Amino acid sequence: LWIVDLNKSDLERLGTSWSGSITIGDKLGVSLNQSSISTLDGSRFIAAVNA
Amino acid sequence: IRVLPRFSADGQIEMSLDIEDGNDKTPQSDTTTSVDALPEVGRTLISTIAR
Amino acid sequence: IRVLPRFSADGQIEMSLDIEDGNDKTPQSDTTTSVDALPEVGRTLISTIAR
Amino acid sequence: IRVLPRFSADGQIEMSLDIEDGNDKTPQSDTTTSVDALPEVGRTLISTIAR
Amino acid sequence: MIEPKEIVDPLTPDASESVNNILKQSGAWSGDDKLQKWVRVYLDRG
Amino acid sequence: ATPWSGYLDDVSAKFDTGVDNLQTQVTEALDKLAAKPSDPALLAAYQSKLSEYNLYRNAQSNTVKVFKDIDAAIIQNFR
Amino acid sequence: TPWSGYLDDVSAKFDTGVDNLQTQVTEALDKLAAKPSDPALLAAYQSKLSEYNLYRNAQSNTVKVFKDIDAAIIQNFR
Amino acid sequence: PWSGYLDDVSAKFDTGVDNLQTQVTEALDKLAAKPSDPALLAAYQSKLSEYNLYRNAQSNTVKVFKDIDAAIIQNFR
Amino acid sequence: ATPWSGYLDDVSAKFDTGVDNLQTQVTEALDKLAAKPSDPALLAAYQSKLSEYNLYRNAQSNTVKVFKDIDAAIIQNFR
Amino acid sequence: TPWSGYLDDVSAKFDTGVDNLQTQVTEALDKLAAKPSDPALLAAYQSKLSEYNLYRNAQSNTVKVFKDIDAAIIQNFR
Amino acid sequence: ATPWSGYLDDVSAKFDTGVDNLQTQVTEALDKLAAKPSDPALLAAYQSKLSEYNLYRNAQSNTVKVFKDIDAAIIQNFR
Amino acid sequence: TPWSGYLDDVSAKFDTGVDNLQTQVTEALDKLAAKPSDPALLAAYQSKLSEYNLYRNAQSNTVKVFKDIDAAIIQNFR
Amino acid sequence: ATPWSGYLDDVSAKFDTGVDNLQTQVTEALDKLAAKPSDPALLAAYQSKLSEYNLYRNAQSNTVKVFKDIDAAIIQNFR
Amino acid sequence: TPWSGYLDDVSAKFDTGVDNLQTQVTEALDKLAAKPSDPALLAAYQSKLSEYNLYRNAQSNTVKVFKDIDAAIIQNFR
Amino acid sequence: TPWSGYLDDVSAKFDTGVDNLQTQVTEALDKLAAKPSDPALLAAYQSKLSEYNLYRNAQSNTVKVFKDIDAAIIQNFR
């Protein structure tokens, strides 16, 4: 009894994501694509890269 | 709704009916926003025959 | 090994045989490539009649 | 060992035989020197009839 | 709403004839493979 | 038809209707304490409510079993 | 006419023997259910629930034994 | 359909408890989705125990009426 | 009119008529202690009263249960 | 399944009634084993393991109750 | 709807969503403090925060235990 | 198989009524025996064993009932 | 020859041949622990073996009882 | 005998989760004992000893809770 | 020799395990009482007494676990 198994697979991930925060004049916080409070009271940006 | 229909010889329809409707008596919560937005209808049950 | 033998007229020997052979399955636990000098063999069971 | 002797006119002795022998399992013998000091002799059981 | 129909004729194109179009337009195809041929031959050709 | 209810149902429901609103008080006091876990007033309230609730559910479930054990004992003698 | 046999006359002695227990049990329960946290209530209901238990077990066992005595005598009429 | 006296004395219980035969299943498949909710547990306990007593009392009653009939039929001979 | 009392009722009543006054002493103690919680003369007394109350209730319940099980075991043998 | 009795149907209701808890607890164990001192992982595992415990208890008691009901009915065929 | 959850998961998540962001606030205020360990403003902040995180996790784990106890007490009475 | 009566037929209708329980229970028995501490294996075993118990009890009472009907009829041939 | 052995004996012995050597492992773990009771790794090792042994003996004897009750109920219908 | 039940497995997961702690805890002890009055060694030891404490506590409580889940199932086999 | 049971054998394994602790702990006390303010004496007694504590507790707990295994088996002979 002959039993035979064969497999192939090919995969690819590539690109970037972004989020961040600024503060202006102690009037306005702004946050982009964060669920955070923008707690720092100062400008932060955070890139994410994978390849 | 549950029903069982009958055809009269006089061109009349006779039905035995059981009807139940309403919102459910939830224990979880009552709050001003809920009562404001979503109507409290009663809950009512009827069983009868009509032609 | 369990066996039951029978003598043919032709001098052929016939026998009922069953054999369990192997080693005890590892305890899902660590070992070293030297200890793998204590070699794996499977666990095998065979049961048949042969002449 | 357990045995039953039978005398045959041919001057042959016949016996039904069962034999058990061995050291009792002590697989966790701790020190190398104890194993070096004591021979492993595998637990073996035999049952047969012979003349 | 319910809409029953009587069925008397098989499909046209065949299932296999249709599947290949999808596979090739997707690029999922593998009959172009150097190796799986030895087995796939028995399934598709037989 | 109206939902059928037996004697054990009756006995059980007496507790639910006996505690008018406890069943919801213990939900509100939780949402509050969870909003401000470090206020002693909210803690001192929730301790009480949760105790009362625990005792209610125990007394209910024991009483229903005591009745079930009488009925099952009588039905055995019909034989 | 409400007809009563001998077994009825037997079981009835228990019912009349306990004057009001049947009621007291329901009263105590209704109190307790309002305030399931007062130890005097809990101790009272424990006592009267267990008296109500023993009452009916003793009743049904003693009603059974007389049935078995009667059936035994009747079987010998043949 | 054809139905004897025992079948009648049985069906009396079925038509007596209108809906319990359903309610025990609906309570069960509510509880099975969320085993840790006290309000579901406390209900299920009472429904299941009611169903228990129901089946027992039905079976003992049918048994007793059978044995009264067998006792009478033994005297025709 | 007056309550029918069984036997277990008599047993419980022996405790109730044993601690003549504790039932109310405990409450008075609590009332004044709660009025002025920071007095160690009040505290030292309330601790004693509350402990006596705990033991009293506990002994009463445990006793009743034992008599219940003796009776139940005798009744079972009638069958 | 090749064959499934009423009791099996009852048990399977619980199994299919909890979607993935079987594996969730398994994964949580390995995570916590990787960092036995993180409060978040601890607070997660406490919950999953409690839930699992109650699931198994409720599952096993029901099967017994249903067994006793059937045994009682079967007895009266005699 | 969420990957799965029992009633206890829910009681836990009520705290985790009641303290909106304390986890990250504490996680970062430490990264401030460690870089200049001797500033009294930074210290007084971190003290105030870590006390909150302590009490939070404490009351969180106790509530789950009490609900598990209440459920076990009822499941035990089925049999 | 070569020869079977009516009682044999009544009996066999259970032996084929349950397709494979006869093996499933022995299978689960040794799966468990290999690892008697696995909750999933325990729960799997408890229900299969309960179903096997009820299957044998239900089978035997029926055969007895039919024997008593047939003996009662045969008694009247004289 | 080999000693005679019924069906119940076989259902029992499927455990004694399923748990390969637990009966020896427990006595080894105890002989090591009694040597130095204050070793954490030895206490941690012994707790598991003892628990496994307990469960093994329970499952064995309960299963033998259940089969003995399924058999007696058939043997009673021979009459 | 490489025989390991479910409880053995559950425990082993921790042993293999803390790969080297088992010895780091002794290395730190020996070098501290070589010179007890050094802040760098004191600060290191504290952080290792505490981790080892919490490791053994979580290890043993998990085992006990599983045992209490099994025993409640096996009780229902009767 | 007098009759000794299996629980006695288990108990005695501990005593014979800790050959001399039984008396070391007493001598340590007799010495320390002579000059209660010698840190060299105190540092020794703390150790001996801790060892004694752990020894007695492990002993009793083990005995009890075997008592409850035997009782559970004996229960089913009926």
**CA atoms of I16 and M6, how far apart (whole Å):** 63
Burial pattern F18-49, b for ≥16 Cβ within 10 A else e, equals bbeebeebbebbbebbbeebeeeebeebbeeb
Distances (CA, A) of I19 to I26, I51, I78: 12, 13, 38
- Comparing CB atoms, the residue among J47, J58, J64 nearest residue K64 is J47
Pairing of strands C13-22, C2-7: antiparallel
- The total number of structural domains in chain E stands at 1
- Comparing CB atoms, the residue among H42, H45, H50 nearest residue F6 is H50
Here the contacts of G61-69 (C-beta below 8 Å, separation 24 or greater) are: G61/F77, G61/I75, G61/I76, G61/I78, G61/I79, G62/G10, G62/I78, G63/F77, G63/G7, G63/G10, G63/G11, G64/F77, G64/I79, G65/I78, G65/I79, G66/G6, G66/G7, G66/G10, G67/G7
Length in residues, chain E: 46
- Confirm if A40 and A21 have CB atoms less than 8 A apart: yes
- Confirm if I61 and G43 have CB atoms less than 8 A apart: yes
- The total number of structural domains in chain F stands at 1
- Nearest chain L CA: its distance from J31 CA (Å): 21
Q: Tell me the residue type at F41.
A: A
For residue H59, give the chain J residue with the closest CA. J73
For residue J63, give the chain N residue with the closest CA. N76
Pairwise CB contact (< 8 Å): J77 & L54: no
- Look-up of token digits 């909150």: K52
- Comparing CB atoms, the residue among L37, L43, L49 nearest residue N6 is L37
Radius of gyration of chain J from its Cα atoms, rounded to whole angstroms: 18
**CA atoms of M21 and M53, how far apart (whole Å):** 11
Six token digits for residue M70: 């399924």
- Confirm if L60 and M77 have CB atoms less than 8 A apart: yes
- Confirm if I72 and G51 have CB atoms less than 8 A apart: no
Distances (CA, A) of H74 to G71, G74, G76, I11, N26: 16, 15, 15, 55, 90
Provide the residue range defining the domain that includes G74: 1-78
E15 assigned to some structural domain: yes
Pairwise CB contact (< 8 Å): F54 & K69: yes
Pairwise CB contact (< 8 Å): E35 & A4: no
- Confirm if I4 and G19 have CB atoms less than 8 A apart: yes
For residue H45, give the chain K residue with the closest CA. K78
- Comparing CB atoms, the residue among L35, L39, L49 nearest residue N73 is L39
For residue L44, give the chain N residue with the closest CA. N73
- Comparing CB atoms, the residue among H20, H23, H53 nearest residue F72 is H53
- Confirm if L46 and J60 have CB atoms less than 8 A apart: yes
**CA atoms of O75 and O78, how far apart (whole Å):** 7
- Look-up of token digits 């666990």: C43
Q: Which chains touch N (3 or more CB pairs under 8 A)?
A: C, J, L, M
- Confirm if N25 and M41 have CB atoms less than 8 A apart: no
**Could you tell me the resolution of this structure in angstroms?**
3.3
Q: Which chains touch F (3 or more CB pairs under 8 A)?
A: B, G, H, K
- Nearest chain D CA: its distance from M28 CA (Å): 8
Pairwise CB contact (< 8 Å): K66 & F54: yes
The yes-or-no reply on E/D contact (3 CB pairs or more, < 8 Å) is no
Degrees, nearest 5: CA angle M62-M64-M67: 110
- Confirm if F57 and K74 have CB atoms less than 8 A apart: yes
* DSSP symbols for L1-28: --S--HHHHHHHHHHTTSSSHHHHHHHH
DSSP state of F4: P
E22 assigned to some structural domain: yes
The yes-or-no reply on D/M contact (3 CB pairs or more, < 8 Å) is yes
- Confirm if L32 and N6 have CB atoms less than 8 A apart: no
Look at residue K1 and give its three-state secondary structure: coil
Torsion of CA F49, F53, F55, F59, to 10 degrees: 150
Pairwise CB contact (< 8 Å): L24 & J3: yes
- Comparing CB atoms, the residue among M31, M62, M65 nearest residue O13 is M31
Distances (CA, A) of G31 to F18, F64, G25, J52: 9, 17, 10, 38
With helix as H, strand as E and coil as C, how does N8-69 read? HHHHHHHHHHCCCHHHHHHHHHHHHHHCCCCHHHHHHHHHHHHHHHHHHHHHHHHHHHHHHH
Q: Which residues pair with B45 in a beta bridge?
A: B20
Residue G77, number of CB atoms within 10 A of its CB = 5
- Nearest chain O CA: its distance from M32 CA (Å): 9
- Confirm if F18 and G34 have CB atoms less than 8 A apart: yes
Pairwise CB contact (< 8 Å): J51 & K9: yes
**CA atoms of M63 and M8, how far apart (whole Å):** 9
**CA atoms of F19 and F78, how far apart (whole Å):** 38
**CA atoms of L73 and B18, how far apart (whole Å):** 52
**CA atoms of M52 and N12, how far apart (whole Å):** 14
Q: Which chains touch J (3 or more CB pairs under 8 A)?
A: H, K, L, N
Six token digits for residue F20: 């008018």
- Comparing CB atoms, the residue among O14, O72, O73 nearest residue M34 is O14
Pairwise CB contact (< 8 Å): H45 & F64: yes
Distances (CA, A) of L15 to G15, J67, L59: 53, 20, 9
**CA atoms of H45 and K78, how far apart (whole Å):** 6
Six token digits for residue D47: 């049952």
Look at residue G11 and give its three-state secondary structure: helix
Pairwise CB contact (< 8 Å): B29 & F2: no
**CA atoms of N67 and E29, how far apart (whole Å):** 52
Residues of K in contact with F45 (CB under 8 A): none
Pairwise CB contact (< 8 Å): G46 & I57: no
Q: Which residues pair with N5 in a beta bridge?
A: none
Pairwise CB contact (< 8 Å): H48 & J55: no
Six token digits for residue F37: 């876990």
Pairwise CB contact (< 8 Å): H56 & J65: no
J-contacting residues of L 3-22, CB under 8 Å?
18-21
DSSP state of O77: G
Residue J37, number of CB atoms within 10 A of its CB = 13
- Comparing CB atoms, the residue among I4, I75, I76 nearest residue G20 is I4
Task: List the determination method.
Answer: cryo-EM
The yes-or-no reply on C/N contact (3 CB pairs or more, < 8 Å) is yes
- The crossing angle, in degrees rounded to 10, of helices I40-76 and I22-35 is 150
Residue G51 contacts I, CB cutoff 8 Å:
yes
**CA atoms of G47 and I11, how far apart (whole Å):** 10
**CA atoms of B22 and B42, how far apart (whole Å):** 6
Pairwise CB contact (< 8 Å): L53 & J74: no
